[PDB]
Symmetry: C3
Subunit: 271 residues, 3 copies
Amino acid sequence: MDTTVPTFSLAELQQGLHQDEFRRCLRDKGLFYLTDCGLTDTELKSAKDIVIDFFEHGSEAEKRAVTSPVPTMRRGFTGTGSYSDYSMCYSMGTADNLFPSGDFERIWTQYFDRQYTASRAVAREVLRATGTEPDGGVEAFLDCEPLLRFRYFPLRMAPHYDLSMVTLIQQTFVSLQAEVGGAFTDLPYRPDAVLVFCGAIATLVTGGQVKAPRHHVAASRTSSVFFLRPNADFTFSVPLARECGFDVSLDGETATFQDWIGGNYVNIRRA
Amino acid sequence: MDTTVPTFSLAELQQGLHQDEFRRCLRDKGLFYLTDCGLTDTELKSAKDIVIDFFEHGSEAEKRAVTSPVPTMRRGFTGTGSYSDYSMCYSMGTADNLFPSGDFERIWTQYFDRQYTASRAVAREVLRATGTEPDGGVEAFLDCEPLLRFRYFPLRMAPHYDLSMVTLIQQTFVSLQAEVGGAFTDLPYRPDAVLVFCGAIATLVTGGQVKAPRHHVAASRTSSVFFLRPNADFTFSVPLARECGFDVSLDGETATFQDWIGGNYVNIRRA
Amino acid sequence: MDTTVPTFSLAELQQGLHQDEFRRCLRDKGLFYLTDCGLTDTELKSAKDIVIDFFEHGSEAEKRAVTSPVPTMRRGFTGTGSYSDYSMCYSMGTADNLFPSGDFERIWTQYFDRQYTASRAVAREVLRATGTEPDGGVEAFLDCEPLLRFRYFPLRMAPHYDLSMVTLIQQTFVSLQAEVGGAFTDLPYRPDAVLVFCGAIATLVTGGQVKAPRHHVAASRTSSVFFLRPNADFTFSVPLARECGFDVSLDGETATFQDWIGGNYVNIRRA
Ligand SMILES: [Fe+2]
Ligand SMILES: [Fe+2]
Ligand SMILES: [Fe+2]
């Protein structure tokens, strides 16, 4: 099997092209670069510059007003010095965001919207290619709880798989590596595309038709990670979950995402 | 902003003094030393000596009778040698305790009581300063599930925040460090005071008016850590939790501590 | 106290022999070698060879057809190279297994059956020796959710206790070490016996009459680990759980394994 990380044009997928190739990719690899999805280097650049600015030229006070009382990295700014001197982060979602100023909010709301739109659209194709209809319908499933995290830096990360439906990654030596065909392959930047990692929820909802590839950071740079995560009430078949590898401890025939993962979102699971 | 860890007299807080300063501290720092709270070096010393004694001169049999069948460090004694040769521990709560003898129980029951009393009292001030009324009332909220852990030693601990309402710490080179104003500051001993770390539950119950500071152990000594933890049925607003940074995966408008954290107490969360 | 890891003949235990010695062992140590339980080097060898073969001479395609879409190590095969170059694994349960071929399935189904039979039988003796009757009865309790994991290799593992009822271990320098009498002792191979670690569920169900010993891997070799895990609906008394060390955050007088551990099986807990 070719261990190459494939690339797909979202527009072409929406047009019904490369359906066999896309299915095979999802099943055998669970990752790919996505082009023509409204996300390019330009957009990244705009949000990139304004956030970096804040990181470097932002005061401790301004950063304070955009720092959550709990260091959950869910919203706002996150960090003998601190760990920001190791890496700084900025997170946001559909609501309850913390923006340092006018120009920042405009650029980042726009950026998030594009990321969310692309994520839902590719996730939509993942569902169609596998003939999947989530309990409660597709749109209810995709109107979910995304989380966008941007990190600016000055092994690093253990091998894990994501627990999202899909995860979209943009970046600026190749850091990120993912397991393909039984070996960790390089995942370099593509100014013209976004890197897509399928997560465990894609595996679950499609009844195991989608692989959730393990990945990690090999030993300055920025990364934008967008987790498309299901709602707490996303429901699925327990017996089906058991059929594709989930070691669930759930009584009954049906369960929710909340029943399975608990009361706090968990984005990754080490492997 | 002054990055100094402030000190407050419990008696003065109960008298209604320094309310603005206390609120600001809770909001901007989430930690402080507390004096006049019935806890001094003397009391610590008494419990300190009798436990150390047990650690050093206690037989493997006596320690066995006070060791739980599961190494949870919830109650009793905890440890080519073992890890006690790295650190020994003794835990206790409101009930189901394991005491090695008469004099030990008397001293430690007394010590625990004082720690619990001080913890509830300062927690009570945290609630009043932020105009907070927990669902179900203040006293029901404070009559909870505390855990006292004493550790005797011969990085060390990753950065984390506590998931308690408040955590009281007494100790005997500065080991403990906490993030203040974006930098890990030293938290030396104060024979006249107890160090107070606000936990995530303080953040949650007050609607985000209290910060839960990250802390860790920098590279012999003893430490007494008292976690004031809520009851499993402590209830809170989900939308409100989301407003202050909690990345909750909870369906519905209200939830309990058990719904959020699960069926086993979790005292800390790495950050 | 003799810190020797005792050995018991399953046949003799079933005959009612060494009941005091067995009780003491369970209470003071929580581990022992078990002979005459239908598990010897021969059986291990047969499954050992056919799996090793697959690991070494198995293609990436054949291994692919027996690899779950999510790297949970629940069923099937698990792994600039990958981590299989560090260790390979093969898991199975009562159903939904992934077998690479005819001879493999026959040998491994037979092997699993023997492991499951032995596990239930010794677990049955653990319950009888401690006069324990699980809520819902013994057989309903033992007809559970076992997990068998076989690992082939080319510190290593932090100290932890298992959350199983009992865990059966077979292996081929002494790697495995367990805490006995306050010190990590060697647990060498015994071609004539299987090593049994009591888990936290044994502690819980028997009301704290059984210890769950901490263990770890000290710094080629194969290991077969069989976790006898309860069903999600296994029910127990909350107050009783609190009495033997479980730091439970459960409202009410009764709870299930699912309530306690959550929606995904957790096999170990670091200590
Ligand atoms: Fe990831
Ligand atoms: Fe802490
Ligand atoms: Fe284990």
